Design an enzyme around this catalytic site. Sequence first.
Site, short mmCIF file in Angstrom:
data_model
loop_
_atom_site.label_atom_id
_atom_site.label_comp_id
_atom_site.label_asym_id
_atom_site.label_seq_id
_atom_site.Cartn_x
_atom_site.Cartn_y
_atom_site.Cartn_z
CG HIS A 15 0.78 -2.42 2.73
ND1 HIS A 15 0.52 -3.75 2.97
CD2 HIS A 15 2.12 -2.32 2.55
CE1 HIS A 15 1.65 -4.43 2.92
NE2 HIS A 15 2.64 -3.59 2.66
CG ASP A 113 -2.42 -4.99 4.63
OD1 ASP A 113 -2.10 -4.21 3.70
OD2 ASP A 113 -1.72 -5.95 4.98
CD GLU A 181 12.79 -6.20 7.27
OE1 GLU A 181 12.43 -5.25 6.57
OE2 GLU A 181 13.45 -6.04 8.32
CB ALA A 324 8.52 8.74 -12.42
CD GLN A 326 7.55 1.84 -10.63
OE1 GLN A 326 8.39 2.50 -10.01
NE2 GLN A 326 7.09 0.67 -10.20
CG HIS A 341 12.52 -1.61 -3.87
ND1 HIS A 341 11.67 -1.38 -4.93
CD2 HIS A 341 11.75 -1.52 -2.75
CE1 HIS A 341 10.45 -1.16 -4.48
NE2 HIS A 341 10.47 -1.23 -3.16
CD1 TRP A 344 2.84 -8.40 -5.29
CD2 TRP A 344 4.69 -9.54 -5.86
NE1 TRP A 344 2.45 -9.49 -6.04
CE2 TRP A 344 3.57 -10.21 -6.40
CE3 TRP A 344 5.98 -10.06 -6.09
CZ2 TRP A 344 3.68 -11.38 -7.15
CZ3 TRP A 344 6.10 -11.23 -6.84
CH2 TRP A 344 4.95 -11.88 -7.36
CG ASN A 345 2.27 -3.00 -5.18
OD1 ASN A 345 2.71 -3.04 -4.02
ND2 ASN A 345 1.00 -3.27 -5.46
CB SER A 346 8.15 -2.18 -8.42
OG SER A 346 7.89 -0.96 -7.76
#
EC number: 2.4.1.-
Length: 443
Positions: A15, A113, A181, A324, A326, A341, A344-346
């Site tokens: 974040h 945020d 959740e 890593a 990424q 998983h 969102w960023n991934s």
Amino acid sequence: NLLHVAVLAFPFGTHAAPLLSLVKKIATEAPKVTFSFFCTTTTNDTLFSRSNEFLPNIKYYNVHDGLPKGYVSSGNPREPIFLFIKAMQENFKHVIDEAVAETGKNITCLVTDAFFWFGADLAEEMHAKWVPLWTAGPHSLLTHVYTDLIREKTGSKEVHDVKSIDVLPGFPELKASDLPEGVIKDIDVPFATMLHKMGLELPRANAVAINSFATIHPLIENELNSKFKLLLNVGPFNLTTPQRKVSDEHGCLEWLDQHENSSVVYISFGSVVTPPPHELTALAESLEECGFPFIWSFRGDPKEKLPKGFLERTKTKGKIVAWAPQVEILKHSSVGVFLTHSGWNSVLECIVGGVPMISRPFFGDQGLNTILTESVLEIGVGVDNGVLTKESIKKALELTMSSEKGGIMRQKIVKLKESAFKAVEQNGTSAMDFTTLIQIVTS
Ligand SMILES: O=c1ccn([C@@H]2O[C@H](COP(=O)(O)OP(=O)(O)O)[C@@H](O)[C@H]2O)c(=O)[nH]1
Ligand SMILES: O=c1c(O)c(-c2cc(O)c(O)c(O)c2)oc2cc(O)cc(O)c12
């Protein structure tokens, strides 16, 4: 030049960095405006000497973390988050006074945020604008905005996965267990109360910025847009606010160069998650069994969390690193699939990379991002029963690596990737919202 921008960042998860990168983009463009970044000492210390080593108009201040002296974890890793949420509103006000005192200028814009619902009230008493940033997807946000309605049309059947709900346009019917959740489940923890209030207060913002691009899903995006005074899609950040920061101590990229196209499996469950031992062994044993080359971003001690001898037994088949590069990994032509998983960023970095996904969500908005990538965008698949087993794993790998479905998936993610690039072009929809965002923030 008296403008002063106060930036309130969430110290947990992914974040603070994305918020900071958005802020830096704005800051370089307005060298005469003063920016104050607020977060915890820990998080700020981590955020330093990166790509943009420093910007003269950005100063960092530490907000109190709400932890008691001599604090040690015992309950859950959510404990310190709850403690932070407890006194965050008053603590942010406290630390804000330091920046005003130092700079001699009153706050003119409060960038926060989106989790910080109190931004509206805080902005109001300061006679300042409020520009919250939702760092996740448009679909989860809409779900939070609809929390009250969702709770209304929900009885026992709904809560017990019996009946489903038509909550989101262009989405499959949702089961309570699928909701981010806090929406329907555990509306009691501080996190849930924070998001609930966020959903109610966002309409008061001068504008709501989001790490997304309009065409990722027109229906959701248009629906979301009608809830706010302004919805500014300023993503995907991995394209609109990239960092020169490229660290690769372990030689992941050179390692990937020695492999063929679409052959390597990249694994990462995010910045914190650590799958349960039985899932880890199931994935470990599945890796060193199907023979796929792999790079596994592992959180924790592998010699301790993985089967005995795994490291030595797969020393040539894959790499296991603590962290890593990424973004670069996902854009590398040798990667054929991303076991994620679904943070969102991934998800966005993978879309730009153009790699099919296998999703095993753990918490937060992950479940909804999986439904989004599997059932709506169809650029990835979830694992049977949402758990990692030798059986569910092998099934997902073959479907994405050796089946026609893998190709259709890559085809679609590629169309999506192109839509992203178009949104970020000089006059694309994101570039434009970003210009609007900058004007609002620096005027
Ligand atoms: O080995 C790794 C693992 C993760 N990340 C970054 O960590 C962030 C994870 O954010 P996401 O929203 O995907 O999930 P979260 O960490 O919030 O659970 C992403 O930007 C990843 O690129 C990385 O750079 N290297
Ligand atoms: O870290 C957390 C987190 O990120 C989220 C989350 C929930 C949503 O519903 C979202 O849409 C979202 O983006 C994040 O919930 C939490 C709930 C907890 O009890 C404890 C946590 O630590 C988190």
